[PDB]
Amino acid sequence: GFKAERLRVNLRLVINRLKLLEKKKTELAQKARKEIADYLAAGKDERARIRVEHIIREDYLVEAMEILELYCDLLLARFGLIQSMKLDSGLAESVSTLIWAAPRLQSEVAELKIVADQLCAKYSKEYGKLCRTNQIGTVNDRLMHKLSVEAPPKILVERYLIEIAKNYNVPYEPD
Amino acid sequence: GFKAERLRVNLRLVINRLKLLEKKKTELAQKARKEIADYLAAGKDERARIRVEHIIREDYLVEAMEILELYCDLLLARFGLIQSMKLDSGLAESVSTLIWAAPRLQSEVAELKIVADQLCAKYSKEYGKLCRTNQIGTVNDRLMHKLSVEAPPKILVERYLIEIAKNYNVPYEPD
Numbered sequence: 001g002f003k004a005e006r007l008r009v010n011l012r013l014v015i016n017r018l019k020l021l022e023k024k025k026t027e028l029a030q031k032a033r034k035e036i037a038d039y040l041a042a043g044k045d046e047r048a049r050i051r052v053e054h055i056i057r058e059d060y061l062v063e064a065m066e067i068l069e070l071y072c073d074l075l076l077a078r079f080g081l082i083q084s085m086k087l088d089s090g091l092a093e094s095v096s097t098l099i100w101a102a103p104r105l106q107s108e109v110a111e112l113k114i115v116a117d118q119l120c121a122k123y124s125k126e127y128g129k130l131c132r133t134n135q136i137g138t139v140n141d142r143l144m145h146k147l148s149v150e151a152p153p154k155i156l157v158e159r160y161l162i163e164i165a166k167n168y169n170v171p172y173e174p175d
Numbered sequence: 176g177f178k179a180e181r182l183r184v185n186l187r188l189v190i191n192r193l194k195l196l197e198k199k200k201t202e203l204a205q206k207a208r209k210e211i212a213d214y215l216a217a218g219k220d221e222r223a224r225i226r227v228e229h230i231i232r233e234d235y236l237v238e239a240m241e242i243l244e245l246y247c248d249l250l251l252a253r254f255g256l257i258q259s260m261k262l263d264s265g266l267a268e269s270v271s272t273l274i275w276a277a278p279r280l281q282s283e284v285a286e287l288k289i290v291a292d293q294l295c296a297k298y299s300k301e302y303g304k305l306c307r308t309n310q311i312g313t314v315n316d317r318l319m320h321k322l323s324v325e326a327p328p329k330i331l332v333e334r335y336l337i338e339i340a341k342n343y344n345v346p347y348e349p350d
């Protein structure tokens with residue numbers, strides 16, 4: 001049961017929700033950068049080294065919500081193309097990536113579920129699973145990576161620490 | 176002709192030079208983000224899309240100078256280990272990456288040449304070329320990538336544009 005109005009409404013609600021969360025998480029991460037500055041000055045460098053990984057995860061998550069927002073923007077911008085026919089290859093990445101990211105992020109942005117669901121209804125649930133587990137190969141690599149909750153590289157962490165150190169004028173201790 | 180004092184002196188001069196350039200390039204990039212905000216408001220979005228790639232290159236370069244600075248920090252911190260014996264595997268990445276990055280960056284940081292040269296003198300010029308063309312496989316992947324002057328991904332550019340748009344409160348036009 002594909003409803004074209006249902007899709008646009010929720011695509012819109014998603015943009016609004018992303019905008020909000022991006023702003024929130026950027027604030028939360030900024031206070032966390034300050035908290036780490038306190039550890040680095042203390043310090044407390046093994047604690048800074050462990051905690052700064054949360055900041056790396058938050059920042060990636062913000063960038064991921066941005067990319068999603070872009071994809072909602074580009075879908076709404078070419079919403080005529082959506083319906084119909086019938087999928088345009090120019091919107092392939094946008095549609096696939098949104099179906100992919102939905103299960104992961106519907107924890108915070110609920111409407112993202114409806115967006116993926118409606119996109120499925122328009123292009124079949126066969127297309128649905130080809131995306132959700134990237135078998136179709138159109139889902140954005142950099143976006144998936146930002147949502148890949150694995151371990152951050154040593155140098156990225158170091159880096160985060162030397163930048164916080166420079167910003168807040170605290171001393172930095174190498175590893 | 177390895178001189179241990181020559182190495183530390185230049186390792187130190189490099190840190191000072193990196194610190195300076197990082198600060199400069201961050202300033203230059205900030206004005207460039209403002210210039211693009213003007214295009215986005217204009218706009219002028221195909222011009223913004225082309226010019227914002229310079230900002231992406233500058234930011235990567237800054238992150239690369241940071242990583243280098245870290246490696247100079249960690250070399251100086253374990254300078255006893257350097258001389259001698261004789262190379263410690265804990266300092267392998269730091270030494271290799273610095274020898275690697277030197278030819279690329281001695282355009283701006285001249286002393287980086289002497290640092291690589293002295294590091295070569297301590298560990299042979301055979302080790303020198305194993306690094307300069309990453310045959311040794313210890314040179315840092317993320318650092319090389321940041322100095323890889325290739326084309327930025329579509330989504331990274333978009334992204335840069337949507338962030339500048341959000342920051343400077345200008346409208347954003349999708350692709």
